[PDB]
Every structure is written in structure tokens, then in C-alpha cells.
Design a binder for this molecule. Structure first.
Ligand code: MG
Ligand code: MG
Ligand code: MG
Ligand code: MG
Ligand code: MG
Ligand code: MG
Ligand code: MG
Ligand code: MG
Ligand code: MG
Ligand code: MG
Ligand code: MG
Ligand code: MG
Ligand code: MG
Ligand code: MG
Ligand code: MG
Ligand code: MG
Ligand code: MG
Ligand code: MG
Ligand code: MG
Ligand code: MG
Ligand code: MG
Ligand code: MG
Ligand code: MG
Ligand code: MG
Ligand code: MG
Ligand code: MG
Ligand code: MG
Ligand code: MG
Ligand code: MG
Ligand code: MG
Ligand code: MG
Ligand code: MG
Ligand code: MG
Ligand code: MG
Ligand code: MG
Ligand code: MG
Lengths: 166, 26, 16, 148, 95, 190, 243, 116, 97
RNA sequence: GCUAAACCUAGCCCCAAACCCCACCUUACUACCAAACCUUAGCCAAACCAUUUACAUAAAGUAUAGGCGAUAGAAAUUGAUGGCGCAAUAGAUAUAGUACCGCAAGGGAAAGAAAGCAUAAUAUAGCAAGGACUAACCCCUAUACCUUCUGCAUAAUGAAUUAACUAGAAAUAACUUUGCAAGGAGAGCCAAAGCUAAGACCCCCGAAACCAGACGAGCUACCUAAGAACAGCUAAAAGAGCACACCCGUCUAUGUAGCAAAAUAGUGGGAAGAUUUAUAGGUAGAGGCGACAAACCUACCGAGCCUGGUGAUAGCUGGUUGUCCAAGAUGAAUCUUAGUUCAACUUUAAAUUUGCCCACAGAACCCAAAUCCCCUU
RNA sequence: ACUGAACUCCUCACACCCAAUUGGACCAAUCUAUCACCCUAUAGAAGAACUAAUGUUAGUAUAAGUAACAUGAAAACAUUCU
RNA sequence: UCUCUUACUUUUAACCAGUGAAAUUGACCUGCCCGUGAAGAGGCGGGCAUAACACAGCAAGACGAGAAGACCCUAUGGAGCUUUAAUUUAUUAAUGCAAACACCUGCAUUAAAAAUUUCGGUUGGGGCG
């Protein structure tokens, strides 16, 4: 197995010079061996990617999927440790930079089929990972406008060369 | 485990090359 | 007719 | 190994099988070419050329009687009693240049070989040996080590 | 044939070959012609003369017989009055 | 190689435990055809062409060839200045350090093969000195061989050993065909 | 691995160990020695060499005995070394025909024999060969005492041999009591076969019977250690008093 | 397992490095990658003929355009230059058409003059 | 993944231990000792292949002949089966005839 | 960054040496009531099969035997502790004959220290690449691989994919390189340049089967012993009627990896009898049993199952793993045409001397194209 | 007229495009001898190389988050109701 | 049942939550027409079409998936059955002859019961080779 996510909280950066932008805090948290399909968990993770901590908690509190409660618990734990151990000033000043689901260690069980035949069930388990970055959530990428998009087209036109010649 | 040293050493050399490419020394 | 073949039970009864 | 068939499968018929046609080595009639071969007596040839060569190189001493033991000790002849060798036969080859006076005992002797031996002033006698006596004569030392 | 006998591990001789063929030491195989004793009353004198002859074998036939016999049958035999003593060796053979 | 006897052995599909029954019928199962769970294709099956039993690699070069090899080794040592003749192997002391220092001073190799005529007459001092050394090996004349001559950088011979080797090796030249094994009595062979 | 000893020597090794080792030497030698039985079901070769007509050469010839099967009923009778031939034949006596299992059985008769040494009449299942052998021996007692174990091949025959030998060794007066002259005449007639009684006791005993006999001979209820210690104490006290 | 291959990693990597830019499992799974890499190398070998074939076609197309700008047809241009003993090849003629239009105009005038 | 991620523990070979140092001594026992002993008598190994060599079929025949009576029951059964199989293979299979 | 990857000793292999309290045969592990011995067969080889084959060294693969053929095959005589092993898919099956499977005989494990996804779905068009290009695509070129075939993109076979494992064993005679040389060889053997030594060369999986010996009649067939069940109505002592329980399984539908390796729902036949059924016992494999359906005999019975012979055999199918170069293509016999042997072709090495092409001359009477032959060239 | 091949020429270089089969030059890794003592060399060996056997074992995919499965109701969780 | 189908209820269904298989699968960036081709094309030629993706249906194609299908032919492959196929009578039952003075052994003959083994090749669809 791999347990690199846990180690990511223990990296100490060198002290910053006074004339240096304040490095945003980063909190890595995980729950391992959740009795839930990683494929089902992925939808919740994707849902809350890039959202503020409060917005993510609000969205998860009203979601019917089982994984929503687990993700909410993980997010609340991440917030608590961000305040206690990672010197985050405001609880709400956190956004989900990364949230993914990973395969867990699964168990194989037998499903009995109808003619003395069978299948192999997998008691599926998943991991859930979050990185919480301090600061307001980064603005959503603006849709590209006709002006910019035509600018790109004209740049492509100008890039043209006379190919296969002197 | 497979007896032998040359394959292991080759792998170590490849790992060292990749490490230098990923985190080249200052 | 060919009888079904059962796989060994140990393979599917494993636990952590 | 080829492609399919008995030859790739490794199961081609025995040697001498001809695909069902009566084999060559069986369609030829039996004839007594080798009947009793193992009971025929064999005599290693000793040409007068070889005898003169041995005498000249000193591997056979003509000053003493020459019998099968002396020939073998000088390595002039190799006797295999187990292969039905009954001894040595004198051979006229080299008679016209034989110039050695020798007392030689052999098992067979051609008339011309006798003539050459006697003209040089020597004596030749044909002496028989059974397989056991021949073995003992050819290799006496092993027999003496047998302790019989 | 038997390439490795079960008792000695040696190569065996096909005795059917020994009963039919004479090997001259140089490498030639002599044989009788098939049918040389069969229904002679209906064969012309020339055919009978051809059949009563001792005949050499092919190169491939000789190779087969060499394979089918062991080295014992391919040795020098100094028989007393062998009729084939002169034929056991080749003379004036260019290639 | 002539002394080599490899003891590697593997089990064939006949000798692997079990594997008598056909695992499943020829037809209908949808699986590959098999005849036993111990065929080479199976995990835990036999080895199709493995090392089979203790195998000897024994063979004898003609004794003339082996004696010629001894002669060639001696010539090579002499020509390359690795051969040293001693009157005797007697040492002032049985201290191995003396022997090592002597070799170093005389610019002998890292490894020295000392040869003496017979096992019994080897001086006690040299016996003691070489018993505690790894690269200074002391052997009787009857033990001389190409392999050890090559393994050891320098070859040290005594004068009696030289005479003995000359006699034994030259005898191979100018000897008849053996009528019977040379262990048996001969007119002039000790 | 390999056994230290060949598996066919394990019986001999066992004979050299345990009670079988304590068995008397003469009986052990009788077991060890094995002599080929007289030819019964095959004609032995006249000589050790023969001129085979095919090539006219002197070739060695051996007598390979035919395996004989002796049903357990034979052990209760006297078949003069005769038994069942369990073999095969070629139908119509040509090797190119079918090969068939064939059992040849001896013709068995019930006859009454009187033993002079035992003064008893035995009804014994017998073969004409046995009758002829008895005639050649000049009586049942002579046949029993002469024929060795291998030729006799009968547990009953060997028991009769042991009985007769014991009778001779003991010169038992039970042979025709109140007729000492007749008893002496019989013993003199069969004098040449007499052997020591210690040996006649072990004649014809199977290995298991010999083992049981030896165990019975050497079984002794352990002596109480009271007796041993009393003897030792008395001996020591005698030594002390003397010294 | 007296002798076991210990280099299989590197033997696999030699092939896979050439497939890393493929689509799908062909860039990961050796069984699939090796077949496509062989096809890629065979195409690379056979493409050396098509490169030369296409360059000449490209040169001929460009020369045709340039000559049509001056009322000539490519056959007339090429034939008349040959007849005037100018041995400029099609690569150079296309380069001149693109980068030396006055020189190409001169050559087209020369070809038409020779034609007349 | 069929590659170990760590260098194996160093393997140190003493080229000058007694076995290697005295290897080969008395290989010329015969030609240097009046042929009292043949070099093959220096060979230590199975009794049935001391100073002898052969293919597997010959080896198995020799093993059965020389120590067959001392073999364990199932080992001897395996040897008999192996001899039978090798006989069939060497005398009935193969490219050449 | 998940899953994972890796590891080294647990042991094992081949040699050498050495010869290694109590309970329990009754229903085993339950304190205590009046008898063993007896040819292996068959697979297989013979290309079927039937006699036959198939359960120290040297003499010698010789004498002998043999559908005289496949093949089998003497004796006289001679005398003689270690590892160029494995290292957890390996090595023992083994952490264990355990778990688990089977009524039973019996079978019999596993394991301890990349792929797949996610970060990051997707853009016209196409074996997914290559030539390229400033540029990912757009342009142009391009009919996956293996095997089997005259010929496969083929809508012929195999393959989801990764890892690990998984398939060329050897003689006779040659050739090459040494040694010695009319002798060689460490007895035996060969020798009219031979002899001695070495080097090079002969795969994997798969039947249906056959036989030996066990194990099976807790299913089912039949039988034995001693039991049990059969409402109500109608009829009267019934192989009686209708119809419950019960037994069966006519027809239909559903189900078809199913609830079920033969079921469900309805419908229907028998239902005091030749009935159904519990218990215990018996008959055993060329056998039993059978109201003969070739039915049944522990889910797969035109002859059970297990173990062994057995690595059965397979002229049949499939598979047969580094790089590179070179030479290399269409008759006879045969229980034979799915194969093989000889030829032809082909490859290698060697010897020495003509080879192909080829005009003129030449090659039949009877009643065309060309070919054959060879001076020159 | 031009276009048009791996034909031919041109600059440079050349053993470098057939099945079965055959000859040959190299060679990965492993072990052994002796080196090197760094990760190799010369040799001797051999369980010596896998894109393919409905191959064996293990992992993980696809089909697919699909087929399928499951808890009568309220309540004070005492209980009641269908 | 049908002309001739309709309505409703339950199950299934579809959506939501939980749990979660199987056959299958060379890779697929997986269009249509005509032509071609190992003779039936998504993939080749010429045309036409063509942003990208879910979800639910359908069953025309993927010579669709399931058992090295069914049927036919081959194998000097099995096995079963029947016989006036070939070879035997070991074994039993009869007799006969010897052998022991009803029983039994050996040898013959005849049966019964069985046992072992084989199924040549080329040609021929409406034959009688
Ligand atoms: Mg079930
Ligand atoms: Mg094939
Ligand atoms: Mg073929
Ligand atoms: Mg087995
Ligand atoms: Mg194993
Ligand atoms: Mg056969
Ligand atoms: Mg003998
Ligand atoms: Mg294991
Ligand atoms: Mg990966
Ligand atoms: Mg295909
Ligand atoms: Mg096919
Ligand atoms: Mg497939
Ligand atoms: Mg019952
Ligand atoms: Mg009633
Ligand atoms: Mg009724
Ligand atoms: Mg019935
Ligand atoms: Mg019927
Ligand atoms: Mg029927
Ligand atoms: Mg069954
Ligand atoms: Mg096979
Ligand atoms: Mg070529
Ligand atoms: Mg025929
Ligand atoms: Mg065929
Ligand atoms: Mg061109
Ligand atoms: Mg060219
Ligand atoms: Mg391999
Ligand atoms: Mg692999
Ligand atoms: Mg595979
Ligand atoms: Mg899924
Ligand atoms: Mg679906
Ligand atoms: Mg559903
Ligand atoms: Mg759902
Ligand atoms: Mg079409
Ligand atoms: Mg397609
Ligand atoms: Mg759809
Ligand atoms: Mg088929």
C-alpha cells in the first residue's frame, strides 16, 4: 500500500523572507478503507472540487449518497486539524484544491448463480483524499469570448510558414 | 527474488537518472 | 451434459 | 522440424521402414554370408616386411626364439583373442627383401614365407593355441597376476 | 532399430541385415539378387545368370545398412581363407 | 570438469505429487484441455526439460595430452619468469611472516605454489609456514597440475622435484602403446 | 536416500537380531542354507555342456526349474515334491496360435501308511510319485528320514521327520512298550539317521514356530528383587566376616 | 528456476518508450504496443519513398502555379529550359518561384522565347 | 515490476579458501605417481557414476543396476517408470532415424 | 496518489555416510461373557493385429531367440560429507496431508517478509500510425497480429490485459580442432593413416480408450425384515366411482447462470392398492438390477467411480521464447494418397575438370510449334 | 509534351527485403574458474530469453455501477393497526 | 383463440438510496451507397455524410454470445451390438482313452458359453456395382 498523503502534512518549508508573498496553508487529509465504491465516491469528490469549505459542507449535507456523509466527516476533520495544527486563522477560509477517491483493499466473496455456477463478488472499499488550501476558492475559468477566440485564430494564421522550401 | 546483480544495478542507474531529471541539482 | 465445476472455497472466504 | 506430420510430431516410423512397401533389407533373400562368423578362426597377418622392420628397429630380438609373446611385447602385432583371433599368420609380403635369420613360431605360415625364413638360415614352426592359451601367451603378466 | 537398449544402453544391430548382406570393410555391401532361387524353370539363362550374381548396394542403401548395424560388423576380420579377402579393399579409386 | 557431478535434479510431471486424474472433461467446460494438474504448463507442475539427477561430466584426455599440458605449463612459467628453482624448501623459521616477506622482497607474485618431492620429506619449517598461509600453497610433486600452476602466480620447485618431473614427463615421450595398464608389472617401469 | 543394506538382505539382517539371533545355531544354518529341490516337473540336462545342433559348438546349459505352486492342502499330505504347474500353453502346440492359461494338477490319492518308528498308521493324501519314492526308500520311515526338507516339501512330512528323529534320539521306550527287543531292532534299523536331541527338536520348524519355541524356552517370571538383594547382602556379609 | 530472466523490465521498456505517444492501451500494454511499434517502424521505413515522391509533386505543383502566373504551362517551362540547356531541377525552380519571383519571371520568359 | 528495487546484499567470494586453493591437486596422480591410482578414483559422488558418464537413460539404467536394491520403494518405482519412458523416447521419438 | 510493486530465509532437492497414566478391531479410541498362502493383466511397439514387444567394466549388442520382424538377448572369461541444487508460482503436496471437495476409496490448496484507475471525459475522418508541420487534429500514405492454407482485412483459428511460469533431451557416420602416429587408447577396441579426446545435432500440451486393484445400492433398480399412512361422499368386501392427505408428472405458461445442474403456477392421472412411505439389511462393474426405456447403479452409464500401469497412444489440432546476414519452391511404392521411404530439388563442406548456350551433320517407316545431339562462341 | 517505381543514373555507403529447411556472425541474463575487485573481461556450464497453446496461477479491467437483491404501517419504540 | 384490440390492477419496468454479478472482450479514433475481395466490408477503391457527449427503446448487421454446436466426411482413433468374419477352448458340460479301484488327475473330441481382433483402396447421388 501507499501512505504518501499522510506524509504530505509533515513537510516543513523554509521560513519565508519578509519581502515574500504569504504562502497559503495546505492541509492534506484522508479516510482509508471506506465501504463504498470508488466509482460512486468519484462523483462526490468531483462535485466538491474547487469549492470553499463551507460551500462543500453545505452541498454534502443535502446529498442523498452514502459517501456524502463520509466526505463531510473527512472535511470537518480536515478543517479542525487545519485550525489546530496548520495555523489556519479562519475556519471558513479554506477551499478544496484536490478531492479524489482511490481504490481500497477489497475482499472477494462468492455469488451463487443458478446452475451450480457462480461469480466472484468484490466487497469494494475506497479511499478518499482531500487537500484544503487556505484562501478564497480560485475563480472559475471564464468562458472564452469570441474576441479572444478569434485572436487565437488570427495568431494561428500568422504562425503559418512556407513549408518544405528554402 | 531472482539471483543476480546486474539487472538490479541497471534499475538503480535508471532510477538515479530519472531522479536527476525530476529534481536536478542546483 | 457437463457438470458445473466449483472453485475452492478458501479463495472466496478470505478476510482481512 | 518442418510443418505437421509425423516428422514434426517426432513420430516418423523406424529406420528401414519404407512406408509399407516391403523394405529393401527384408526383400533381399537371406544368404549365409556371416553364418558362423563368430566361430571362424582369425589370424592377424605378420608380413615379412613388418618382421624385418621390427628386427631392424630392435623391437624384436632375433637372437632369441620369436614367439607370439615376443611379437606382442615388441608391439609388432596386436592379438584380440576375444575377437576370435587364433594367433599370427606369416605373410609373404616383403619376402624378396627379408634378410634376417630368425627362429619364429606362428600359427599359420604361407609357403613363400616359410621359404624366405628358411633361405635366410632361420627356422619357422606353426604352433597352435586354444583361445585360453592364446590369451595367456599374448598377455602373460595379467595371467600371472590372476594367481592361477 | 534400438538406439539405446534397455539393459546396456547400447545401440543394437538389426539381425535381418546380418542375415542378408555382406559388408566389405572398405564400406561396400554385397547381396544376392531377389528371386535367385525362385521358379528358375521359367527364367531365361541370361536372367538366371544375372540372378545368381553377388551385387553391390547403393550409397544410400549402404548408409542405411551402416546405420542398422553396429561397429562390430564393420571391423577388419582376418579369416583363414575368406573368399572376399581381396574384395575387402579398394584399389586405384580416384575420388 | 572431469570431477564435476552436478546434483541438480527436478521433478518431471511423472514424479510430481498427485496429478493422476483428468482435471475436467475434454468437452463442454469451456476451458482448455488438460490431462493432469502437474503437467509443465501448470503452476506446481513438473519441469519439462530440467536437470535430471546427479549427472557426471567425466572424460579423460589422453595421458599424453595431459602430460603435454604439464610440460606447457612449466615452459610458460619459466619463459614468463614465474618459475624459481630452490635447492630445498628449508626455512630459517616456521613463521609465515618470514615467507611472505621473502616473497615480497624477491618480487614473487601474490600467490606462490611451492612443490616438494614427497609429502613425508617436506621440511617441518616450510610445512608450518605454509599451513597458516592462504596464497602460499605447498604441495607434493605428485600433486602438481596445470590448474594450480595457473592459479598461483609463481611456481617454486625444488631440484629433486625438477628431476622427478623431468623423468615422469619425458617418459610419456618414447613409450610404447600400453599392452595393459601401467600399474601392472612391466620390464622397466617402476 | 538409499538404504544402507539391500532390501533383499533385510530378512538375513533380522535373523541376526533379536530372538532370531538367540535361536540355536544349527537351526539358523538349516534356514539359511537353500538347496535346489530334485527335478520333478522337468527333465534336467544330462551334463553342463552340450553340442547344439544348429552351429555344432559346445555351449553351457543350465537347469532352470519350473515354478511349482503348492496349495496349502499339500502341507497336510505327502506329495513327493509334486505340485501345481501354473503356466501357459500354445493352443495346438504352435507358437503362432493363441496363448492360454493352463494349470496341471497332480493326481492325489488317499493312502494309509504305517510308521515303524512311530508305531502309528497315518492316512495321508499322496501322489504316485510319493509312492514310488517310498518304494525306492524301502519304507515311509526311510523316505521321511532320507528326503531333505526341500525334496519332501510338506509341513506334515517335516513334522513326521521331527517326530521320528526325536524318537530315535531319545530311544523312547514308548516305541512298542513291553517289547524291548522289537524297539531295539527298530532303533538299530534306523540308527544311521540318529542326531542329538537338541537338534532333533528344531527339525522342520518354520521360522515362526522356532521363534515361539525360543520365546517359551526363555520366558521366565522375573525373580523378585527381594531374593537378589538378600543374596547380595548375605554374600557381602560373608565377605566382611571373613575379612 | 536455475536461470530466470532478470532484464525483462528493460526489454519491455525498449519497446514501450517508442509507444508512449500512442493512443489507448497501445502505449502501455506490451502485447499491444509491440505490434503497433513494429507497424510504426515499418511505416517510417516505407515513408522515405513517399517523402521524395511528395516533394517532387509539391515542387511540380508550385512550379505550375508560378509558371501559370506568367502564362506558361509546366510542361512548356520544363521542356524549354532543358532545350535552352538550363539544368535547374524542380526543387530549385520551386524555391525560385517562392523567393526569387523576378528570376522565375526571367526563366518563364526564357522558356516562352525558346518555345517561339 | 519483475525487477527488484534494492541492490542484493554483496556477495563476497574467497578465491583463496582451502578448497579453491587446493583445487585440482592430484589430478595427475596417475601420470606422476607410476599409475598406482587413476585420476577418476579421485572423484567423490554417487557410487553409480564415479568415473563414468552417460545420457539420462544410461544413467538411470546404471543407477538401477548398481543401487536399485538399496533404493526406497517409490524412488525405485519412479526410476523404473523413468527408464521405461526414456526408452520409449530415445528409441521411438526424434528428428533423426 | 491509490491499488500495487519489490525483498530472504522458512524450508526443500540430490549425494555421501550410518542399517532405522487412561482408551482403542463393538458403531475404533467403548473398564468387565462360552481365521492367510494361489501365473498379473493391459496400455504400448509391431505404423492395424492375432505369435511376439511391453512389469562395475569388458566379452557384446556377440552367440542366440524372433509373424527370423518389430524387436529380445546371454554366458564362459575379466575383476571393481558435499553441491557451476531451488529460494515462497521455485524447492517437498506441505505453514498441511491441514482447510476444503467426495458417501467412500480418494483428490487436495493458498499464503510470510505492471496492468487498473485518479490527478485530467469528449470534437468531423476511420488498424489509430507514419511523412510531416510553426502548429495535437486537419493534409498525404497505410486492408491488426498468430496459426492454417494455393490464396486470409477477411464475416477462418487464438488472444481482455499485466506479472510470473510455460516447450529440441541422443546416437551411427561425418566435419572441425588438439595429441600421438603404423600405430592409438590408462587392459577389453579399432587400425591398409589410423586411433584417442573434445566441439555440434533430434520439443510441449491434449483424447475417447484398455487393463489391475480398491471404493461405492444414505440416490436410483430390485429384493429381505419388521413398521406406518390412506379425510369425506358414493358404494359394498372392489387392482370400484368422485375426491383430500399422499404419490405421480398430461398439457400450458413462466424460468433457461433460473428459487431450482429439471423449479414455479395452473391444469391433470392414481389416491384400499401391482399403492405410497420411514428404518435397517442385500445384490457391484462385463458385474448387479431392470413390468426392456440401453432404464438405473451418488447430478455427466451402450457399461460407475478412484488409484495405478500412465508422461497411455494420437499419421490429428494447437503451441514451440534473443539479434543479424546468407543459400533456399511443386516422380515411384505404400491397408496409401491428413502419413512415410526412395528419387528429384535443397543446404553445407570437399575433390578436379569441364558444364550450359550452341550452328552444320545427324535422329522411320507405317500413316505443327518444337525437341534431342554439340564444333565454336 | 509532361507526369510516372524500390528500374537506371547521380553524392555517399553497402552482408543489411522469400515459406519449410539449411550455413554462419553475434548475443541478454544466470552460475563456476580466474580476473575485475565499479557493476567488467577471458573461458567452462546451463531449468539460458515468450505479442500467441479456449496455456497454469495471481492481479485488475470490460460488460457495469449494469442484471439482480431487500424492510407491511404509525407510534410513546410500551403498543396498536392492516 | 380470432375479426381487432382496448381498459385497469400487480409484477417487471424507469428515477432515487444501499449492496452488487455473468457470458463476453486482438486493438478500435467502431458511418451510408456502389464496386471489389478467401467469392457477404465500419476498416480496401470511388462517391456521400460527418461538432461532442448522456438516457430510454429496437433487434437489421457485427457471417452476434453461449459446447473445439447439429448434420456430412476422414483417422490403418475408440467403443457397443450381431453373426455362417478370423483365431482359440484356457473354463465349464458331455462323452472316449489312460490313471487311481462314487471321487479325482492327465490327454483327446464335440458342444455350450464366451474371449481377442479386424472392418483395404479408387470410383458410383435415384442403386442392386
Ligand atoms: Mg445447487
Ligand atoms: Mg503447427
Ligand atoms: Mg508433411
Ligand atoms: Mg502420475
Ligand atoms: Mg513442485
Ligand atoms: Mg500397434
Ligand atoms: Mg559374466
Ligand atoms: Mg510451494
Ligand atoms: Mg501504472
Ligand atoms: Mg479474425
Ligand atoms: Mg479450424
Ligand atoms: Mg476469442
Ligand atoms: Mg437402500
Ligand atoms: Mg377413504
Ligand atoms: Mg380405485
Ligand atoms: Mg419397475
Ligand atoms: Mg425396445
Ligand atoms: Mg433403442
Ligand atoms: Mg455418476
Ligand atoms: Mg502425446
Ligand atoms: Mg536471400
Ligand atoms: Mg499392403
Ligand atoms: Mg495419414
Ligand atoms: Mg521519379
Ligand atoms: Mg537497384
Ligand atoms: Mg526455458
Ligand atoms: Mg510475460
Ligand atoms: Mg497466454
Ligand atoms: Mg464498475
Ligand atoms: Mg446495458
Ligand atoms: Mg432491475
Ligand atoms: Mg441503484
Ligand atoms: Mg459489398
Ligand atoms: Mg469487422
Ligand atoms: Mg443505447
Ligand atoms: Mg470440431
Amino acid at each position: 500500500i501507499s501512505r504518501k498523503w499522510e506524509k504530505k502534512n509533515k513537510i516543513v518549508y523554509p521560513p519565508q523572507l519578509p519581502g515574500e508573498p504569504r504562502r497559503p496553508a495546505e492541509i492534506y487529509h484522508c479516510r482509508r478503507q471506506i465501504k463504498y465504491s470508488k466509482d460512486k465516491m468519484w462523483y462526490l469528490a468531483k462535485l466538491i472540487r474547487g469549492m470553499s469549505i463551507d460551500q462543500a459542507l453545505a452541498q454534502l449535507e443535502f446529498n442523498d449518497k452514502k459517501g456524502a456523509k463520509i466526505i463531510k466527516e473527512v472535511l470537518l476533520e480536515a478543517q479542525d486539524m487545519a485550525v489546530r495544527d496548520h495555523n489556519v486563522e479562519f475556519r471558513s477560509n479554506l477551499y478544496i484544491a484536490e478531492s479524489t477517491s482511490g481504490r481500497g483493499q477489497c475482499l472477494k466473496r462468492i455469488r451463487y448463480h443458478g446452475r451450480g455456477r457462480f461469480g466472484i463478488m468484490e466487497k469494494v472499499y475506497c479511499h478518499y483524499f482531500v487537500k484544503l488550501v487556505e484562501g478564497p476558492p480560485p475563480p472559475p475559468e471564464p468562458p472564452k469570448t469570441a474576441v479572444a477566440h478569434a485572436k487565437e485564430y488570427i495568431q494561428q494564421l500568422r504562425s503559418r510558414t512556407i513549408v518544405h522550401t528554402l | 527474488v531472482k539471483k543476480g546483480f546486474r539487472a538490479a544495478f541497471r534499475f538503480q542507474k535508471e532510477l538515479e537518472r530519472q531522479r536527476l531529471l525530476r529534481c536536478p541539482p542546483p | 451434459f457437463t457438470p458445473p465445476i466449483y472453485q475452492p472455497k478458501f479463495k472466496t472466504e478470505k478476510e482481512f | 522440424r518442418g510443418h505437421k506430420g509425423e516428422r514434426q510430431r517426432g513420430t516418423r516410423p523406424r529406420l528401414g521402414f519404407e512406408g509399407g512397401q516391403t523394405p529393401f533389407y527384408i526383400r533381399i533373400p537371406k544368404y549365409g554370408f556371416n553364418e558362423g562368423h563368430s566361430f571362424r578362426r582369425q589370424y592377424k597377418p605378420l608380413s615379412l616386411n613388418r618382421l624385418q622392420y621390427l628386427i631392424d628397429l630392435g623391437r624384436v630380438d632375433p637372437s632369441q626364439p620369436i614367439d607370439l609373446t615376443q611379437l606382442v611385447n615388441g608391439r609388432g602385432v596386436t592379438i584380440q583373442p576375444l575377437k576370435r583371433d587364433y594367433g599370427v599368420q606369416l605373410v609373404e609380403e616383403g619376402a624378396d627383401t627379408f634378410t634376417a635369420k630368425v627362429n619364429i613360431e606362428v600359427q599359420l605360415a604361407s609357403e613363400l614365407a616359410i621359404a624366405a625364413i628358411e633361405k635366410n638360415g632361420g627356422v619357422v614352426t606353426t604352433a597352435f593355441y586354444d583361445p585360453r592359451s592364446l590369451d595367456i601367451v599374448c598377455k602373460p603378466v595379467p595371467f600371472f597376476l590372476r594367481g592361477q | 532399430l534400438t538406439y539405446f537398449s534397455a539393459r546396456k544402453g547400447k545401440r543394437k544391430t538389426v539381425k535381418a541385415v546380418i542375415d542378408r548382406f555382406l559388408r566389405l570393410h572398405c564400406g561396400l555391401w554385397v547381396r544376392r539378387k531377389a528371386g535367385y532361387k525362385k521358379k528358375l524353370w521359367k527364367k531365361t539363362p541370361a536372367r538366371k545368370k544375372r540372378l545368381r550374381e553377388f551385387v553391390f548396394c547403393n550409397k544410400t542403401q549402404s548408409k542405411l545398412l551402416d546405420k542398422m548395424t553396429t561397429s562390430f560388423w564393420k571391423r577388419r576380420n582376418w579369416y583363414v581363407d575368406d573368399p572376399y579377402q581381396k574384395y575387402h579393399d579398394r584399389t586405384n579409386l580416384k575420388v | 570438469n572431469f570431477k564435476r557431478i552436478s546434483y541438480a535434479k527436478t521433478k518431471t510431471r511423472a514424479e510430481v505429487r498427485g496429478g493422476g486424474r483428468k482435471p475436467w472433461p475434454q468437452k463442454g467446460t469451456g476451458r482448455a484441455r488438460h490431462g493432469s494438474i502437474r503437467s509443465p504448463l501448470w503452476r506446481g507442475g513438473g519441469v519439462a526439460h530440467g536437470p535430471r539427477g546427479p549427472t557426471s561430466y567425466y572424460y579423460m584426455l589422453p595421458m599424453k595430452v595431459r602430460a603435454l599440458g604439464l610440460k606447457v605449463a612449466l615452459t610458460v612459467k619459466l619463459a614468463q619468469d614465474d618459475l624459481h628453482i630452490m635447492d630445498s624448501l628449508e626455512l630459517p623459521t616456521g613463521d609465515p611472516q618470514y615467507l611472505t616477506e621473502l616473497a615480497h622482497y624477491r618480487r614473487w607474485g601474490d600467490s606462490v605454489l611451492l612443490v616438494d618431492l614427497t609429502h613425508e620429506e617436506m621440511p617441518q619449517s616450510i610445512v608450518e609456514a605454509t599451513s597458516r598461509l592462504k596464497t602460499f600453497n605447498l604441495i607434493p610433486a605428485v600433486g602438481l597440475n596445470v590448474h594450480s600452476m595457473l592459479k598461483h602466480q609463481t611456481l617454486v620447485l625444488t631440484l629433486p622435484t625438477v628431476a622427478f618431473l623431468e623423468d615422469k614427463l619425458l617418459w610419456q615421450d618414447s613409450r610404447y602403446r600400453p599392452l595393459y595398464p601401467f600399474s601392472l608389472p612391466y620390464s622397466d617401469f617402476p | 536416500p538409499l538404504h544402507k543394506y539391500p532390501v533383499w538382505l533385510w530378512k538375513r539382517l533380522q535373523l541376526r537380531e533379536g530372538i532370531c539371533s538367540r535361536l540355536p545355531g544349527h537351526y539358523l544354518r538349516s534356514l539359511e542354507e537353500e538347496r535346489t529341490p530334485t527335478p520333478v516337473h522337468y527333465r534336467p540336462h544330462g551334463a553342463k555342456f552340450k553340442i547344439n545342433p544348429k552351429n555344432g559348438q559346445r555351449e553351457r546349459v543350465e537347469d532352470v526349474p519350473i515354478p511349482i505352486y503348492f496349495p496349502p492342502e499339500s502341507q497336510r499330505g505327502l506329495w513327493g515334491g509334486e505340485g501345481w504347474i501354473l503356466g501357459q500353453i500354445y493352443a495346438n502346440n504352435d507358437k503362432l496360435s493363441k496363448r492360454l492359461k493352463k494349470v496341471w494338477k497332480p493326481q492325489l490319492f488317499e493312502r494309509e501308511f504305517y510308521s515303524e518308528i512311530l508305531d502309528k498308521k497315518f492316512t495321508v493324501t499322496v501322489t504316485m510319485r510319493t509312492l514310488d519314492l517310498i518304494d525306492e526308500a524301502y519304507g515311509l520311515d526311510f523316505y521321511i528320514l532320507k528326503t531333505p526338507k526341500e525334496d519332501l516339501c510338506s509341513k506334515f512330512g517335516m513334522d513326521l521327520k521331527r517326530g521320528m528323529l526325536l524318537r530315535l534320539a531319545r530311544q523312547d521306550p514308548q516305541l512298542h512298550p513291553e517289547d524291548p527287543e522289537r524297539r531295539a531292532a527298530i532303533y538299530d534299523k534306523y540308527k544311521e539317521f540318529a542326531i542329538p536331541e537338541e537338534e532333533a527338536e528344531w527339525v522342520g520348524l518354520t521360522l515362526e514356530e522356532a521363534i515361539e519355541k525360543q520365546r517359551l524356552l526363555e520366558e521366565k517370571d522375573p525373580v523378585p528383587l527381594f531374593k537378589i538383594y538378600v543374596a547380595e547382602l548375605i554374600q557381602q556379609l560373608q565377605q566382611q566376616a571373613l575379612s | 528456476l536455475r536461470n530466470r530472466v532478470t532484464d525483462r523490465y528493460f526489454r519491455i521498456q525498449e519497446v514501450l518508450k517508442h509507444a508512449r505517444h500512442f493512443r489507448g492501451r497501445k502505449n502501455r500494454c506490451y502485447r499491444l504496443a509491440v505490434r503497433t511499434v513494429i507497424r510504426a517502424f515499418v511505416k517510417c521505413t516505407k515513408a522515405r519513398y513517399l517523402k521524395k515522391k511528395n516533394m517532387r509533386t509539391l515542387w511540380i505543383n508550385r512550379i505550375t502555379a508560378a509558371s501559370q502566373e506568367h502564362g506558361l504551362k509546366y510542361p512548356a517551362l520544363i521542356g524549354n529550359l532543358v532545350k535552352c540547356q538550363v539544368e535547374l531541377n524542380r526543387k530549385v525552380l520551386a524555391d525560385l518561384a517562392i523567393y526569387e519571383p523576378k528570376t522565375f519571371k526571367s526563366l518563364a520568359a526564357l522558356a516562352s522565347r525558346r518555345r517561339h | 515490476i519483475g525487477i527488484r528495487l534494492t541492490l542484493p546484499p554483496p556477495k563476497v567470494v574467497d578465491r583463496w579458501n582451502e578448497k579453491r586453493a587446493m583445487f585440482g591437486v592430484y589430478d595427475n596422480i596417475g601420470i606422476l605417481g607410476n599409475f598406482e591410482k587413476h585420476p577418476k578414483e579421485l572423484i567423490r559422488g554417487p557410487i553409480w557414476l564415479r568415473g563414468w558418464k552417460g545420457n539420462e537413460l544410461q544413467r538411470c539404467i546404471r543407477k538401477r543396476k548398481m543401487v536399485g536394491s538399496r533404493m526406497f520403494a517409490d524412488d525405485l518405482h519412479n526410476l523404473n517408470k523413468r527408464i521405461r519412458y526414456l526408452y520409449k523416447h530415445f528409441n521411438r521419438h526424434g528428428k533423426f532415424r
